[PDB]
């Protein structure tokens, strides 16, 4: 198909994320290639090279078409595409589980593979519910979180999305009613943790788990909070016997400057979700990890098993590329790489602070954010960024980037320059 | 790298399996080291042995594993573009696949929402149905209706429409949405069943968004078949009472029941349809939810303005690319004759099981063969007996069953059926 033909088919038959059919303000742009940190897009019938500043929604940590990941895939493809995980096991699943259990916060000893982040969140909730049922306490079945969060689009996942301002707001009426603490602030305030404890205390007998994104809240507003809050959550959850779940689907694999965001606080959750960058952005895969204690309690319960099992569970292809992606990350000095990236983003975005429409500029590891004083118009922002050789996808009032770790200093500055110019257009 | 013994050690300590325990498994999983065509290479007492994939790795491996055309499609796409975000971008694999799916599915299904698993595709279908009625100013239409015996996945919404017994709803007291269940649909056509279904629907019509069913064949919930005329009745009932009809063809799709889609046996189109499993030829997790122009426009013209769903890896180029190849390979051969031959092979091979003491039913529908027993099939007895005969079989409850790859030769079908008959013989 030609780019024109692709556009015609797409307009007629393809639903896009959080979109309409036939009522799109803009057509999507045709992507024809991706190599390293660069995408080849079609603009006015002509191919153009642009930087993947979003890492394809925080997935492409090693860039696209990395030789190590490409070959990990083709090697596995030669041997075994897929087998059912019921009654069978395999090397890619075992290699990946071993890696994950070793590199995640201490105590996370068991791994349940699934095919997406949302599902891995549903699995985490199921683990928590079955845990308490295994303890003879089925009343512990609600979840508690703080505002500003996002955990996916399946119905249970939706129930812990930010209620007033989050994308799932119109659905309250049919969702499970969960417990919400106020928005966690950026700076550490002991009063916030005290209020969190007081609220949790009154629901403790009906709460299975606290579920949060640690340090960085992604899709709910690219907000950062002091890691000390995670220390407080761990303590509160311990004392009130509520499980603690960290959703690291966006924060995992070095993105915030530590291997996992929980590491900023030295905290171990009882249950943890990973996804996105897990596969280096080649294929959909996610994982839910839990402690031996959680695993044993579920396994000793009336169910005698965790009642979940997706068709493509532990897909060899996805696992094999993930093994390669994780090994590639661990085999380099990733901490220095992310520190250099963060410094690059900080230096490059500094000028944005002075712009009339900019309310905040913030950086955390390989995450750069310009917060504007109004919703960003994509019809203006998209071409402006493309004009400067960068693919940016603002959302709400945020112009932000989570670049591939392989971006050179020059490429980071190109990205931040495009961000600043988008922000300039917002205010003019 | 890990040896089979090392794999078992890692797996026992760290890996969850579908609907399994950690540390309380009756039998260790068997190490799978390769898969090619209709055959898996498994480790039995340290030795690699080749056995037939009688289940098609749970419906998925329709062209067998490592089909050269499907391998080549994946590697071709890998050299061009592994993945890009589907927010603001489109691409050829998504367009090519959407075009194919619209063309081959029951008439009227004009739009395609890609997701990363069957459960997610079912949640998307439910979301379409609920948002549809919100767009019609009828938000009270929020419940789902189904018949007993069904299975639609493991996420919390999907669980709510699973058979209450198969889905162990007794373990989920007041966590699941309470849906409307009709009695088990019978094998033979009885107008009284449909009249009763209609009367039950009628009294719930004002609070029902949709009827959701698996058409012709109920898979994971009991491998039951029903007369296609029941689907004709559902279409009519849903039409007259203004309730949407959703067919879940995640297991039945792509020729498995002897028609391209099971709905084709009835000459009916649903308002919303789910596909998965065989979609990718079993290479990778991908699913799709299709809906009519009416459904898509009613959602889009609603005050909400957008379907609030969008998985990170939506419309993954690699998965879409191998699916395009899998669909084209199916359509480019005389698949109808192939399935007819497979059905005949299964019928002939399983015929001797009818006379066995512990056998209550023997049934075949397209490339699906089932022996139902009068008691639970003992896995510790069933596995070695099938493995001796060069066949991987996975009985559950009282059922010994197969859904073989379409590429299976008459000799392989004879091998598969003989193993099934022997498992049934040992039950009695
Ligand atoms: C912390 C966290 N937990 C779970 C999920 C859901 O994972 P998944 O999409 O694989 O089901 C996610 C999903 N992340 N979503 C995205 O990064 C975005 N999707 C869109 C779509 C449209 C506009 C912006 C975004 S950000 C997540 O960040
Ligand atoms: C009609 C239909 N709709 C939706 C789903 C859910 O798809 P997914 O597992 O990709 O989320 C499915 C999933 N089917 N699952 C399987 O056939 C099996 N899963 C397991 C798990 C453990 C042991 C046996 C089986 S069979 C389905 O058949
Ligand atoms: Cl978007």
UniProtKB/Swiss-Prot annotation, chain A:
GO terms for cellular component: cytoplasm. The lineage of its organism: Bacteria, Bacillati, Actinomycetota, Actinomycetes, Mycobacteriales. The record marks 18 as: Participates in the substrate recognition with KAPA and in a stacking interaction with the adenine ring of SAM. It is found in: Cytoplasm. The keyword Transmembrane does not apply. Disulfide bonds: none annotated. Its EC number is 2.6.1.62. Pathway: Cofactor biosynthesis; biotin biosynthesis; 7,8-diaminononanoate from 8-amino-7-oxononanoate (SAM route): step 1/1. Its cofactor is pyridoxal 5'-phosphate. This is Adenosylmethionine-8-amino-7-oxononanoate aminotransferase. It catalyses: (8S)-8-amino-7-oxononanoate + S-adenosyl-L-methionine = S-adenosyl-4-methylsulfanyl-2-oxobutanoate + (7R,8S)-7,8-diammoniononanoate. It comes from Mycobacterium tuberculosis (strain CDC 1551 / Oshkosh). Homodimer. Catalyzes the transfer of the alpha-amino group from S-adenosyl-L-methionine (SAM) to 7-keto-8-aminopelargonic acid (KAPA) to form 7,8-diaminopelargonic acid (DAPA). It is the only aminotransferase known to utilize SAM as an amino donor. HAMAP family: BioA. InterPro entries: Aminotrans_3 (IPR005814), Aminotrans_3_PPA_site (IPR049704), BioA (IPR005815), PyrdxlP-dep_Trfase (IPR015424), PyrdxlP-dep_Trfase_major (IPR015421), PyrdxlP-dep_Trfase_small (IPR015422). PANTHER family: ADENOSYLMETHIONINE-8-AMINO-7-OXONONANOATE AMINOTRANSFERASE (PTHR42684:SF17). It is an enzyme of class 2 (transferase). Substrate binds at residues 57, 150, 276, 309, 393. Its main location: cytoplasm.
